[PDB]
RNA sequence: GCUUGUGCUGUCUUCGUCCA
């Protein structure tokens, strides 16, 4: 449901008829794992059979696709792939079986599950440790560099927990060197850094006093005001919202020659979206973005004035662990986007012939099936062609030399 | 000519290198060869 | 080629009396017989 | 057969690229020559350098 | 004259689509302001359009899927204009009766035949 | 199935030439009022260099191919085969000189 | 992972004021409130708010794996419902000064006897201990 | 063919459980077809049409065949698994730890 | 025998099969899958019948 | 009259062993 609508339009003129073709994705249906033989029959699969015959313990996934034919003058379950099933989970066949049928199924009652069976080989996903998102971290740059402190934040949307953008606020100028200690802010899809006053005005707060009101929270602290003074002096050249947005729009890495109004619209787009996306995405909600910018600049100043130590990178409460869930979610997002692009390409090719496509031919379940199977079998957590420069060892063969080693391998990070 | 045993119902049968590898009675896809007839001796040590 | 290669044999004399084996190498009288339980192969004259 | 100078330049640059990546596939500032599997091509230079190279 | 890279085997398809759009938009408020377009079998992957403005080229390529994502357009040199339309292997004049030729395949593969 | 008219250089389907004739060469070949004989001799299905012309008058390509006085459509740079001598003599009777587009004559 | 919408509803119910109604000159003593790293509002009586949030979490109203952090030194109050946070359980010591049980564990021999039996005296397992406020 | 023995195989090309196996001995017999040479010049029963692709036992190992599994793969061809069992008695050079 | 003939013989003996532990476990698993399908479809009538059938088949020793 | 056959992949990845 992240991208639930594929859209194809065709302003046919061959009596102008504007036709829109669009397909919607509905419900997801899952089943218990099944095994399909060469003679064509099917039967319920159990993990011992998959281990003995070098099968993959996986279940089919069905998706409801609804097709509509929009025209202006001026659909059932499709199999999208097979997902490997983790043993002893809610979707495993061994979850229900009691102690006696577990013995009849040749399963050990001491076995705990938590692994997958790909081609008869037991694979365990290793938890990946990453830094937390949506937190401001202030660091000190080393001596052979004009930058003395940096304040970086990585933003991730709550739905899906996926990284979107990274924004930094560098503090140029060394102690007693480089004249003024200007504060430049790095922005996404912008080729060169930007002083904080210009972007602050671009968000829609012009007066310098209110910029200081947003940044600082105690007027008697003359030192932070002194450190902000060079930024005010540098940004004094810009004094209006619209010229500030235009200045944003010139450096926005877009195609050369864009007109001024379109540049301003592009700046408005790149400012509303992709600038601190975790805060908000709608228009006219930039007050919170200005307050958060003031908070980041305040943290940068507090660290720069030796009032606080730089953030501990190795602190464990600032780290996160990715279990089977998030890793499989990222992998499935990539594979589903690939499948959607394939469906789009096939639809574009088919509209040339102008036929009432079954829609059970556009979908290639082999994409998701092979991608998941390859990633779990080899441990390379990405597309097969993208194996170079990709994370490796995320999936390993389960250790079975002794029971304690199996437990340790199942609880590793 | 060669004896087998089903992996599910432990039924014995034979194959002639032309039948599908399946159990006759319960249709399991997993079968095992029977133990040889040669003499088996151990040194009890 | 001797007619005794790859044939089940029993030892009748010496320190391995009454042990079942299989003849693997037979050049001149010194038959090489693998022992069913000890994972080893031993030389032995054909007389035994 | 027929010589549009742009097409000559394109195909001759392709020939130069092939001859260059046949001997050195670690050229800085340009993409490597890749195999159909996506792995980079093993050039003659890479056979002679490193711990696993010819010399060492 | 501008040349634009396209996908292999779709050059004639792009030529026919350009002609169809030119005919359809003729007599309208915003006709396709081009003059001619063509391609050559030997010069694979190239489609040459004769116009006067780059915006006309962009309008002509608009709505086509065989054109690659990047605007891979270049200005053809004026001297190359005659070379782009020069003929090739045209002097030849069909097969001549009485000549001796060899057979490519079949039961008489390689036998000389008159 | 498409054929390239030898005289004017236009490319149209062979059945279009049989049913409707060549829209430009009809004044001197009478292709619309002729049998498959004249269609086969004056149009060839083997060609190279598909050309689409939008504006005959101002296109330098049209002047270079001598097609600036003809109907816009599909054109061929090179056409295999030449017009027969009797058709050439008939065109010379009409006062029109025929320059072959086969490339062998230059 | 847990949704943050009930957390925001509880915070807005208990006197949190949004950012648009915030003046840094006027609010020289208010506490900034963060939810999943997003500054969502301010409050002037953080003690009552943190007590109410902690009591709600200990009663099962809020999910037990939600983080409730009060930074007194920096005047911040942070809440995390993110996925991937590593946690461990601990006994809760009755810290209420007004209570007689101050300085003593909340878990008693009655809880141990109920755990050994397996049911409450009008299933009693680990989750029953967690939602009774003796473990968090 | 290989240098090991083939007399321990059965008619179906598989060894039976309970048989002693030494290094290099053949436990799975498999052949692949090969387009015959000019041996159709006359070789009544001794013209080669197959190439050997058998599986020998590891040269450093020996033991008893414990269990032989026969089934079919996902595609539909035959599929075999042979398990060998042996006993390892402690000796000089074996590693122990507290 | 062919694959179809073997499957027909297996189905015939399954019809003749009074009881077999492996087949009872497979049937109970299939019934559990049908039960979760009925529960997810909010069918309050089918699930009672499947529960009654499972209760009749179950209670092993 | 009947004679004994003569050998082996590559490239990555992961987990380990003994020092350091
Ligand atoms: Zn059976
Ligand atoms: Zn004509």
C-alpha distances in Å from residue A12, one per residue of A20, A66, A73, E18:
10, 23, 10, 15
Chain D residues close to E83, C-beta within 8 Å: 2-4
Q: What is the DSSP letter of E28?
A: S
The maximal CA–CA distance of chain D, rounded, in angstroms, is 50
CA–CA min distance H38, chain C (Å): 30
Neighbour-count burial for A324-351, b at 16+ CB within 10 Å, e otherwise: bebbbebbbebbbeebbeebeebbeeee
CA–CA distance, H21 with H26 (Å, rounded to integer): 8
Q: Name the experiment that determined this structure.
A: cryo-EM
Strand ranges across the sheet with C41-45: C8-10, C20-25, C30-35, C41-45
Altogether, the residues listed in chain F come to a count of 106
Count other C-beta atoms under 10 Å from residue F24's C-beta.
Answer: 19
CA quadruple E102, E104, E108, E114: dihedral positive or negative?
A: negative
Altogether, the residues listed in chain D come to a count of 56
For residue C24, the SS3 value is: strand
Nucleotide nearest to A392 (CA to C1'): J13
CA–CA distance, A232 with G5 (Å, rounded to integer): 39
- Span CA (H37) to C1' (J8), Å: 23
Residues 6+ apart with CB under 8 A from C34: C21, C22, C24, C40, C41, H20, H22
Name the pairing type of β-strands F10-12 and A194-195: unpaired
For residue D37, the SS3 value is: coil
Residues 6+ apart with CB under 8 A from E19: E37, F52, F54, F72, F73, F74
Chain C residues close to H7, C-beta within 8 Å: 6
Segments of H39-93 assigned E as strands: 50-52, 55-56, 63-72, 78-85
CA–CA distance, A98 with D31 (Å, rounded to integer): 58
CB G102 within 8 A of CB G94: yes
In a 10 Å sphere around its CB, with 0-12 CB exposed, 13-18 middle and 19+ buried, how is residue G35 labelled?
buried
Q: Hey, is the C-beta of E77 within 8 angstroms of any chain D C-beta? A: yes
Phi-psi region of H38 (alpha: psi -120 to 50; beta: other; left: phi over 0): alpha
SS3 readout for chain G: CCCCHHHHHHHHHCCCEEHHHCCCCCCCCCEEEEECCEEEEEECCHHHHHHHHHHHHHCCCCCCCCEEEEECCCCEEEEECCCCCCCCCCECECCCCCCCCCCCECCCHHHHHHHHHCCCCCCCCHHHHHHCCCEC
Domains in chain B (CATH in brackets) are: 1-45 (2.20.28.30)
Residues with CB under 7 A from strand J: A 378-379, 392-393, 396, 399; C 1-2, 5; D 39; H 1-3, 24, 53, 59
CB C19 within 8 A of CB C28: no
Phi-psi region of D29 (alpha: psi -120 to 50; beta: other; left: phi over 0): left
Task: Report the residue of chain C nearest H65, measured CA to CA.
Answer: C36
- The annotated binding site of F is made up of 5, 8, 22, 25
The maximal CA–CA distance of chain B, rounded, in angstroms, is 44
Q: Give the helix/strand (H/E) hosting I1.
A: none
Chain B residues close to I9, C-beta within 8 Å: 24, 27
Counting Cα atoms < 13 Å in the Cβ hemisphere of B5 gives 12
C-alpha distances in Å from residue A18, one per residue of A72, A349, F6:
5, 19, 41
Contact between chains at B30 and A37 (C-beta distance less than 8 A): no
CA–CA distance, D46 with A185 (Å, rounded to integer): 42
Phi, psi of I7 (to 5 degrees): -65, -40
Question: What range defines the domain where residue A238 resides?
Answer: 137-320
Looking at chain I, the number of H-run helices and the number of E-run strands are 3, 0
CA quadruple H36, H40, H41, H42: dihedral positive or negative?
A: positive
Phi-psi region of A78 (alpha: psi -120 to 50; beta: other; left: phi over 0): beta
Count other C-beta atoms under 10 Å from residue C35's C-beta.
Answer: 18
CATH number at residue A281: 3.90.1110.10
Integer-rounded Cα Rg, in Å, for chain F is: 13
Give the position of tokens 């279990």: A323
Give the position of tokens 């999208």: A80
Instruction: Show the DSSP H helices in A106-170 as ranges.
Output: none
The CATH label, of 3.40.50.150, 3.40.50.80, 3.30.40.210, 3.20.20.120, for the domain at F2-103 is 3.30.40.210
CB B1 within 8 A of CB H11: yes
Bridge partner residues of C44 (DSSP): C31
Phi-psi region of A383 (alpha: psi -120 to 50; beta: other; left: phi over 0): beta
Phi, psi of I43 (to 5 degrees): -100, 95
Nucleotide nearest to H51 (CA to C1'): J7
Count other C-beta atoms under 10 Å from residue A300's C-beta.
Answer: 22
Instruction: Show the DSSP H helices in A174-259 as ranges.
Output: 196-203, 208-215, 222-235, 241-250
Interface of chain B against chain I, CB under 8 Å?
Answer: 8-9, 19-20, 22-27
Please name the member of H16, H72, H78 whose beta carbon is closest to the beta carbon of B33: H16
Count other C-beta atoms under 10 Å from residue A222's C-beta.
Answer: 8
Please, which chains are in contact with D (at least 3 CB pairs closer than 8 A)?
A, E
Stretch 83-112 of chain G: residues touching chain A, C-beta under 8 Å: 83-86
Q: Hey, is the C-beta of B41 within 8 angstroms of any chain C C-beta? A: yes
Counting Cα atoms < 13 Å in the Cβ hemisphere of A173 gives 17
Q: What is the DSSP letter of A313?
A: T
Q: Give the helix/strand (H/E) hosting A373.
A: helix A365-378
CA–CA distance, I31 with G75 (Å, rounded to integer): 58
DSSP, residue by residue, A219-243: TT-HHHHHHHHHHHHHHTT--SHHH
Nearest CA among E12, E14, F45, E91 for reference residue D1: E91
Q: What is the DSSP letter of A301?
A: H
Looking at chain F, the number of H-run helices and the number of E-run strands are 5, 5
For residue F31, the SS3 value is: helix
Give the position of tokens 């049908």: I34
CB G40 within 8 A of CB G11: yes
C-alpha distances in Å from residue A137, one per residue of A121, A279, G42, G136:
42, 17, 22, 29
Count other C-beta atoms under 10 Å from residue E42's C-beta.
Answer: 13
C-alpha distances in Å from residue A299, one per residue of A149, A294, A348:
11, 9, 51
CA–CA distance, F11 with B44 (Å, rounded to integer): 96
Nearest CA among F75, C47, A91, H50 for reference residue E38: F75
What are the structure tokens assigned to E47, written together?
């489609």
Ligand nearest to the CA of B9: 1
* Percent composition of chain B: helix, strand, coil (DSSP 3-state, to 5): 0, 25, 75
CB A35 within 8 A of CB I29: no
Please, which chains are in contact with C (at least 3 CB pairs closer than 8 A)?
B, H
Residues 6+ apart with CB under 8 A from A103: A109
C-alpha distances in Å from residue A330, one per residue of A40, A122, A154, A162, F22:
34, 22, 17, 8, 61
Nearest CA among F42, F52, F49, F54 for reference residue F3: F42
Domain spans in chain C, listed from the N-terminal domain onward:
2-48
Contact between chains at A105 and I25 (C-beta distance less than 8 A): yes
Task: Report the residue of chain A nearest I28, measured CA to CA.
Answer: A97
In a 10 Å sphere around its CB, with 0-12 CB exposed, 13-18 middle and 19+ buried, how is residue E81 labelled?
middle
């Amino acid at each position: 449901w992240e991208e639930p609508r594929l859209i194809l339009d065709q302003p046919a003129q061959h009596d102008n008829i504007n036709k829109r073709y669009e397909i919607r994705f509905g419900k997801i249906y899952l089943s218990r794992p099944t095994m399909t033989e060469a003679d064509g029959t099917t039967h319920a699969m159990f993990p011992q059979e998959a281990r003995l015959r070098n099968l993959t313990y996986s279940s089919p996934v069905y998706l409801d696709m609804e097709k509509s034919m929009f025209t202006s003058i001026d659909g059932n379950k499709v199999h999208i792939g097979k997902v490997p099933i983790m043993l002893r989970s809610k979707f495993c066949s061994l979850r229900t079986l009691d102690e006696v049928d577990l013995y009849k199924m040749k399963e050990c009652p001491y076995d705990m599950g938590g692994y997958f069976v790909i081609n008869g080989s037991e694979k365990v996903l290793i938890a990946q440790e990453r830094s937390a998102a949506n937190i401001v971290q202030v660091f000190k740059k080393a001596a052979p560099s004009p930058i003395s402190h940096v304040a970086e934040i990585r933003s991730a949307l709550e739905k899906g927990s996926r990284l979107i953008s990274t924004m930094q606020i560098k503090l140029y100028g060394r102690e007693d060197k480089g004249t003024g200690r200007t504060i430049k802010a790095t922005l996404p899809y912008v080729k060169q850094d930007i002083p904080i006053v210009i972007v602050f005005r671009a968000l829609g707060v012009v007066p310098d006093g209110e910029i200081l009101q947003h940044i600082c929270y105690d007027e008697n602290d003359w030192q932070m005001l002194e450190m902000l003074k060079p930024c005010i002096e540098e940004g004094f050249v810009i004094q209006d919202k619209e010229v500030a947005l235009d200045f944003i729009g010139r450096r926005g890495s877009a195609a050369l020659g864009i007109r001024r109004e379109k540049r301003i619209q592009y700046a408005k787009d790149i400012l509303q979206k992709e600038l601190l996306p975790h805060i908000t995405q709608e228009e006219g909600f930039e007050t919170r973005k200005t307050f958060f910018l003031g908070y980041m600049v305040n943290r940068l100043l507090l660290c720069a004035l030796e009032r606080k130590d730089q953030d501990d990178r190795d602190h464990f409460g600032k780290k996160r662990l990715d279990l089977a869930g998030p890793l499989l979610a990222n992998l499935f997002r990539i594979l589903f986007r690939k499948l959607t692009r394939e469906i789009y390409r096939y639809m574009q090719r088919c509209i040339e012939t102008d036929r009432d496509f079954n829609l059970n031919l556009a979908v290639k379940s082999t994409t998701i099936t092979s991608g998941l199977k390859y990633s779990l079998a080899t441990g390379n957590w990405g597309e097969q062609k993208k194996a170079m420069s990709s994370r490796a060892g995320v999936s390993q063969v389960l250790n079975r030399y002794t029971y304690s080693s199996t437990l340790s391998h199942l609880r590793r990070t | 000519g060669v004896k087998y045993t089903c992996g599910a119902c432990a039924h014995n049968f034979s194959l002639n290198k032309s039948d599908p590898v399946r159990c006759k009675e319960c249709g399991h896809r997993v079968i095992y060869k029977a133990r040889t007839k040669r003499m088996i001796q151990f040194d009890a040590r | 080629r001797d007619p005794t290669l790859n044939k089940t044999v029993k030892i009748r004399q010496g320190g391995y009396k009454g042990k079942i084996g299989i003849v693997k190498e037979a050049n001149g009288d010194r038959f090489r017989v693998e022992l069913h339980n000890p994972n080893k192969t031993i030389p032995i004259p054909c007389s035994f | 057969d027929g010589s549009p100078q742009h097409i000559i330049n394109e195909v001759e640059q392709l020939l130069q690229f092939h001859v260059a990546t046949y001997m050195d596939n670690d050229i800085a500032g340009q993409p490597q020559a890749l195999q159909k599997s996506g792995r980079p091509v093993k050039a003659i230079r890479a056979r002679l350098k490193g711990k696993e190279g010819r010399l060492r | 004259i501008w040349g634009v890279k396209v996908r292999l085997g779709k050059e004639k398809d792009v030529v026919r689509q350009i002609l169809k759009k030119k005919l359809a938009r003729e007599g309208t408020k915003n006709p396709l302001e081009i003059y001619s377009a063509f391609q050559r079998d030997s010069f694979k992957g190239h489609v040459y359009i004769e116009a006067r403005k780059a915006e006309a080229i962009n309008d002509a390529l608009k709505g086509n899927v065989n054109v690659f994502s990047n605007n891979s357009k270049f200005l053809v040199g004026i001297v190359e204009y005659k070379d782009l339309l020069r003929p090739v292997k045209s002097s030849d004049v069909k097969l001549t009766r009485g000549s001796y030729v060899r057979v490519k395949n079949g039961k008489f593969k390689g036998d000389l035949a008159q | 199935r498409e054929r390239a008219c030898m005289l004017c250089g236009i490319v149209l389907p062979g059945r279009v030439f049989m049913q409707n004739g060549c829209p430009n060469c009809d004044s001197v070949l009478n292709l619309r009022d002729s049998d498959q004989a004249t269609v086969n001799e004056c149009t060839s299905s083997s060609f190279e260099g598909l050309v689409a012309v939008g504006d005959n008058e101002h296109s330098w390509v049209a002047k270079w191919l001598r097609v600036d006085r003809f109907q816009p459509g599909l054109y061929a740079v090179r056409v295999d085969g030449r017009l027969p001598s009797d058709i050439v003599a008939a065109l010379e009777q009409y006062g029109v000189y025929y320059r072959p587009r086969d490339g062998s004559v230059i | 992972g847990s949704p943050s919408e009930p957390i925001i509803n509880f915070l807005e119910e208990w006197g949190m004021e949004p950012l648009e109604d915030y003046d840094p000159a006027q609010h020289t003593k208010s506490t900034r409130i963060f939810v999943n790293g997003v500054w969502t509002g301010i409050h002037r009586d953080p003690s009552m708010l943190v007590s109410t949030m902690r009591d709600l979490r200990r009663s099962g109203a809020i999910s037990p794996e939600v983080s409730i952090i009060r930074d007194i030194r920096e005047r911040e109050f942070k809440i995390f419902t993110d996925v991937g946070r590593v946690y461990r359980p601990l006994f809760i010591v009755e810290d209420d000064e007004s209570k007689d049980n101050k300085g003593e564990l909340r878990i008693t021999k009655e809880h141990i006897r109920k755990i050994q039996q397996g049911y409450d005296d009008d299933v009693y397992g680990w989750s029953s201990l967690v939602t009774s406020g003796v473990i968090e | 063919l290989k240098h090991g023995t083939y007399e321990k195989l059965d008619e179906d090309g598989l060894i039976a459980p309970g048989v002693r196996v030494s290094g290099d001995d053949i436990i799975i017999g498999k052949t692949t077809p090969i387009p015959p040479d000019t041996e159709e010049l006359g070789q009544r029963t001794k013209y080669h049409t197959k190439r050997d692709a058998s599986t020998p036992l590891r040269s450093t190992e020996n033991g008893i065949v414990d269990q032989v599994l026969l089934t079919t793969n996902q595609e539909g061809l035959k599929f075999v698994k042979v398990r060998m069992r042996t006993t390892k008695v402690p000796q000089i050079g074996d590693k122990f730890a507290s | 025998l062919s694959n179809d003939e073997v499957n027909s013989i297996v189905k015939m003996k399954q019809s003749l099969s009074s009881n077999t532990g492996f087949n009872t476990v497979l049937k109970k698993a299939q019934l559990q899958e049908e039960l979760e399908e009925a529960r997810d479809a909010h069918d309050h009538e089918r699930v009672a019948r499947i529960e009654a059938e499972l209760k009749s088949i179950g209670a092993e020793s």
